[PDB]
Amino acid sequence: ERLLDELTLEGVARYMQSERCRRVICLVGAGISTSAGIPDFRSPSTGLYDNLEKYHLPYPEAIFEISYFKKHPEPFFALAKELYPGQFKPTICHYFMRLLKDKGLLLRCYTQNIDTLERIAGLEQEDLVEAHGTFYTSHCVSASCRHEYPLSWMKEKIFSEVTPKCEDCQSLVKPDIVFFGESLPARFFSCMQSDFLKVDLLLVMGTSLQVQPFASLISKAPLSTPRLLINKEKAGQSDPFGMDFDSKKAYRDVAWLGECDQGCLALAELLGWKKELEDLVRREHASIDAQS
Amino acid sequence: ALPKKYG
Numbered sequence: 001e002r003l004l005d006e007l008t009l010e011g012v013a014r015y016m017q018s019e020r021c022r023r024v025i026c027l028v029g030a031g032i033s034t035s036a037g038i039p040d041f042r043s044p045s046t047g048l049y050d051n052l053e054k055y056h057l058p059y060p061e062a063i064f065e066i067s068y069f070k071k072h073p074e075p076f077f078a079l080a081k082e083l084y085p086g087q088f089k090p091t092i093c094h095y096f097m098r099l100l101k102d103k104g105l106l107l108r109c110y111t112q113n114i115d116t117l118e119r120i121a122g123l124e125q126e127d128l129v130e131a132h133g134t135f136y137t138s139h140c141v142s143a144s145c146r147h148e149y150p151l152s153w154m155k156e157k158i159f160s161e162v163t164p165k166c167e168d169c170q171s172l173v174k175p176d177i178v179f180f181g182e183s184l185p186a187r188f189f190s191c192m193q194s195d196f197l198k199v200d201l202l203l204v205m206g207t208s209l210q211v212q213p214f215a216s217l218i219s220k221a222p223l224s225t226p227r228l229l230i231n232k233e234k235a236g237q238s239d240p241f242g243m244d245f246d247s248k249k250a251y252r253d254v255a256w257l258g259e260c261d262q263g264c265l266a267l268a269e270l271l272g273w274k275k276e277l278e279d280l281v282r283r284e285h286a287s288i289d290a291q292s
Numbered sequence: 293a294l295p296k297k298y299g
């Protein structure tokens with residue numbers, strides 16, 4: 001017995017306003033922040049793995065790998081300065097998840113992003129699994145110290161082009177991100193082992209589902225749980241050498257192919273939330289402009 | 293150690 005009456009956005013919206021849809025998990029990646037000015041990996045030329053020649057790395061991926069960072073942290077901090085945004089304005093997609101929170105539907109947002117825009121949009125620590133960590137806080141790397149430093153401190157170090165050193169022990173201070181090759185936080189595994197017991201909808205947005213173990217999250221929901229992908233490209237399908245949008249067996253997965261902001265706007269409109277979402281985004285962006 | 297981030 002399948003829960004969606006049809007494998008379309010309109011079917012997902014009718015399901016969301018049925019009594020059965022009480023707990024929504026969002027799984028999000030870099031595609032929800034490109035319209036906020038943070039580049040993803042997939043975009044041609046503007047992806048973060050391009051335009052790295054100046055750094056003289058052994059291979060492009062080394063800039064985000066923990067072994068290399070440990071020996072040579074300077075390239076990463078130079079890239080961070082180049083990418084640091086003038087303003088942190090969450091996107092329409094971020095504010096759609098704020099609405100899910102406000103309306104009591106959001107069980108959890110699992111994010112691969114480190115850019116802090118979920119928190120700025122008003123998602124609380126309880127609402128979030130920052131699976132790959134965050135720039136919001138940083139720590140001295142010495143095991144016997146671990147002094148914490150805020151983003152305002154780390155930003156000044158990044159822009160002054162001074163490698164951040166701990167004021168207590170002079171060790172390196174590292175943003176609280178999970179580099180490739182580092183263990184994910186315990187919170188990721190503990191939330192993953194509880195949240196998917198009775199989730200009613202997975203909303204997957206702005207990710208290619210190529211980084212593990214985050215990508216395995218789509219497989220943790222019950223087999224009946226609908227899964228909606230809002231993304232520029234179809235993602236999460238089994239490799240011919242997972243999501244089933246198109247087979248004769250397809251029964252619960254829906255792909256809306258386009259910009260995350262436009263997809264969330266379309267879904268909001270079907271739900272009767274379009275004015276609420278427009279008003280929220282305009283008010284939040286105006287407030288961010290005013291506080292500057 | 294907990295599972296590591298890999299592409």
Ligand SMILES: NC(=O)c1ccc[n+]([C@@H]2O[C@H](COP(=O)([O-])OP(=O)(O)OC[C@H]3O[C@@H](n4cnc5c(N)ncnc54)[C@H](O)[C@@H]3O)[C@@H](O)[C@H]2O)c1
Pocket residue numbers: 028029030031032033034035038039040041042043048112113114115132205206207208209210211230231232233235258259260261
């Ligand atoms: N903002 C960030 O924190 C950030 C940015 C770049 C990379 N990363 C890291 O690198 C990896 C990136 O994996 P990922 O899957 O999140 O990113 P990815 O670049 O591998 O894939 C992003 C996906 O979003 C799609 N997309 C891009 N812009 C979109 C838009 N506006 N609307 C709809 N779809 C859009 C792309 O087509 C692609 O499928 C993760 O490990 C993550 O931690 C993070």
Ligand SMILES: [Zn+2]
Pocket residue numbers: 140141142145146147166167168169170171
């Ligand atoms: Zn220290």
